[PDB]
Amino acid sequence: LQMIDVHQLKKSFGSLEVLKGINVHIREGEVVVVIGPSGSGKSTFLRCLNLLEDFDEGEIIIDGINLKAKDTNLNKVREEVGMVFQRFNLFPHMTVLNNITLAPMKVRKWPREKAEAKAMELLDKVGLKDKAHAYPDSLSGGQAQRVAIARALAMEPKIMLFDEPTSALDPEMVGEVLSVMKQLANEGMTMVVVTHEMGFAREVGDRVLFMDGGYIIEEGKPEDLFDRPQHERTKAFLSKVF
Amino acid sequence: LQMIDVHQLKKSFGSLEVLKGINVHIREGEVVVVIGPSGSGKSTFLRCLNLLEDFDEGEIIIDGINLKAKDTNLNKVREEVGMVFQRFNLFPHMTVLNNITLAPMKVRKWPREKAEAKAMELLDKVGLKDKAHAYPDSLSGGQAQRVAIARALAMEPKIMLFDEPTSALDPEMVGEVLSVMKQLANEGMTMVVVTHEMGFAREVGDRVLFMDGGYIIEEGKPEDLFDRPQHERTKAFLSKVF
Numbered sequence: 118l119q120m121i122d123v124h125q126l127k128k129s130f131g132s133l134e135v136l137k138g139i140n141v142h143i144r145e146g147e148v149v150v151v152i153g154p155s156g157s158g159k160s161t162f163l164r165c166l167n168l169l170e171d172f173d174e175g176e177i178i179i180d181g182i183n184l185k186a187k188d189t190n191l192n193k194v195r196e197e198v199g200m201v202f203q204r205f206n207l208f209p210h211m212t213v214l215n216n217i218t219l220a221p222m223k224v225r226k227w228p229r230e231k232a233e234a235k236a237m238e239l240l241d242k243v244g245l246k247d248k249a250h251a252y253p254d255s256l257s258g259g260q261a262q263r264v265a266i267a268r269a270l271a272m273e274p275k276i277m278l279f280d281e282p283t284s285a286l287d288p289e290m291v292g293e294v295l296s297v298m299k300q301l302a303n304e305g306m307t308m309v310v311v312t313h314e315m316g317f318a319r320e321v322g323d324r325v326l327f328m329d330g331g332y333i334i335e336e337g338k339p340e341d342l343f344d345r346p347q348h349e350r351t352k353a354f355l356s357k358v359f
Numbered sequence: 360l361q362m363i364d365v366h367q368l369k370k371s372f373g374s375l376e377v378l379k380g381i382n383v384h385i386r387e388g389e390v391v392v393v394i395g396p397s398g399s400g401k402s403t404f405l406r407c408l409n410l411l412e413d414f415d416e417g418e419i420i421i422d423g424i425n426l427k428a429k430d431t432n433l434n435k436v437r438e439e440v441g442m443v444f445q446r447f448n449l450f451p452h453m454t455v456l457n458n459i460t461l462a463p464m465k466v467r468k469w470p471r472e473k474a475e476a477k478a479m480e481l482l483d484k485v486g487l488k489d490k491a492h493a494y495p496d497s498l499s500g501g502q503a504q505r506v507a508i509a510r511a512l513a514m515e516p517k518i519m520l521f522d523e524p525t526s527a528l529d530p531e532m533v534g535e536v537l538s539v540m541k542q543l544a545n546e547g548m549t550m551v552v553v554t555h556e557m558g559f560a561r562e563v564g565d566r567v568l569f570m571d572g573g574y575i576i577e578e579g580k581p582e583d584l585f586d587r588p589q590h591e592r593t594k595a596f597l598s599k600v601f
């Protein structure tokens with residue numbers, strides 16, 4: 118059972134508790150959308166799942182693997198989980214192609230060149246094979262983020278975490294990235310997607326989790342949560358985004 | 360003169376020649392501003408200077424070291440040349456401070472205490488010592504680019520390259536970045552800056568090089584080239600600014 122299992126997870130940056138007891142159970146192939154104001158721990162939660170962040174209390178089990186067990190191969194799980202940030206996914210001094218093959222070639226000891234056959238692959242997947250030999254400075258935000266996804270997908274992960282992949286793009290460039298994330302969900306990928314694009318949520322998401330104050334205030338199918346929120350706070354937040 | 364000595368530099372991508380015989384010599388402490396239409400070969404030129412791109416013909420000599428010659432320490436040239444990009448630079452998984460000290464420690468082999476002291480020092484110099492322990496996602500673009508400049512300077516380079524560092528920043532964020540760049544030129548740093556911020560050029564640059572079609576078409580003091588362009592192509596390009 119369960120691809121992602123989180124129990125009473127708590128995190129504190131110094132003296133401040135950022136996550137105050139989070140419980141989440143994500144099934145394989147589920148697309149969970151996380152929403153909520155800024156500073157409610159959305160990004161911190163994702164960093165814990167991708168092991169970029171350590172935590173205080175609770176347990177985190179990635180596909181049967183507890184992240185804090187003695188006999189755990191942590192780097193096995195690190196490769197297992199891919200992540201796309203709102204910004205800073207690409208190295209500006211490297212070509213799009215080399216960006217995508219940097220990790221597989223160096224971590225997965227893989228491949229030196231199935232190393233780049235994989236990359237040309239995904240580039241066609243996101244519709245930018247035509248940009249293989251370009252540098253990040255030539256790409257639009259929309260293209261750059263599509264490349265960041267192809268880069269995360271390059272490691273062949275079972276889980277894909279998106280941290281507001283489009284919130285830094287102007288209105289007209291959001292569509293192309295979301296479209297790729299949609300095609301990804303339709304392919305059976307387990308995805309935890311933090312976003313404010315409540316249109317993508319409805320369309321692609323299985324469940325939605327509304328976070329606020331380091332707690333998960335309410336959850337439920339997009340339809341039910343966006344149309345019929347049950348908690349006032351969920352209303353107070355939705356009534357200024359949807 | 361001699362900090363950057365370039366002779367008959369040619370570079371082609373396939374049968375298309377991007378740089379068609381560039382000759383230029385930059386003296387130590389000189390601030391050279393590069394302007395021109397997109398596709399003119401401005402980014403490629405900086406990439407050859409920073410060993411990010413190889414070239415087909417000609418000779419490039421950085422601070423007396425031929426990049427093509429039977430083994431010069433190519434890594435030492437990389438060490439002395441710093442570069443700032445348009446689509447900026449930050450490891451989203453590390454704090455600002457750590458982003459800055461990484462190279463100083465990994466490449467220059469500086470002890471952690473000496474590395475952080477220089478980083479705190481630079482952060483303060485760009486008005487961001489408060490962000491030291493923050494992650495990049497908490498920074499605005501103006502702040503992120505200032506962190507990327509600080510990280511570049513952390514290596515104590517002798518040459519600082521800028522490939523349109525403000526071309527992707529919202530207007531309200533341009534000024535804080537150009538300011539830092541201005542303080543850099545005033546303090547004596549040898550700089551090469553590709554930009555369309557002509558105000559910065561007139562104010563900081565010693566010489567402006569107008570590039571077009573892979574050739575350096577015209578050069579001159581900022582005032583002279585802007586107020587009285589001698590070449591028709593320079594005029595045609597300058598006709599569209601302001």
Ligand SMILES: Nc1ncnc2c1ncn2[C@@H]1O[C@H](COP(=O)(O)OP(=O)(O)O)[C@@H](O)[C@H]1O
Nearest residue numbers: 130135154155156157158159160161492493494
């Ligand atoms: N590296 C850090 N150091 C100290 N505090 C942090 C750090 N990262 C995040 N925080 C704080 O933790 C709280 C939640 O952050 P975050 O997970 O990014 O919220 P969200 O991603 O939903 O905007 C905020 O107070 C944020 O400033």
Ligand SMILES: Nc1ncnc2c1ncn2[C@@H]1O[C@H](COP(=O)(O)OP(=O)(O)O)[C@@H](O)[C@H]1O
Nearest residue numbers: 250251372377396397398399400401402403404
């Ligand atoms: N890998 C490539 N294949 C084909 N053409 C390229 C490649 N890289 C760059 N070019 C072309 O080289 C020329 C100069 O590019 P560039 O250095 O980015 O100019 P600028 O920085 O002034 O916009 C342009 O025609 C650009 O499209």
Ligand SMILES: [Mg+2]
Nearest residue numbers: 156159160496
């Ligand atoms: Mg966040």
Ligand SMILES: [Mg+2]
Nearest residue numbers: 254401402522
């Ligand atoms: Mg350019």
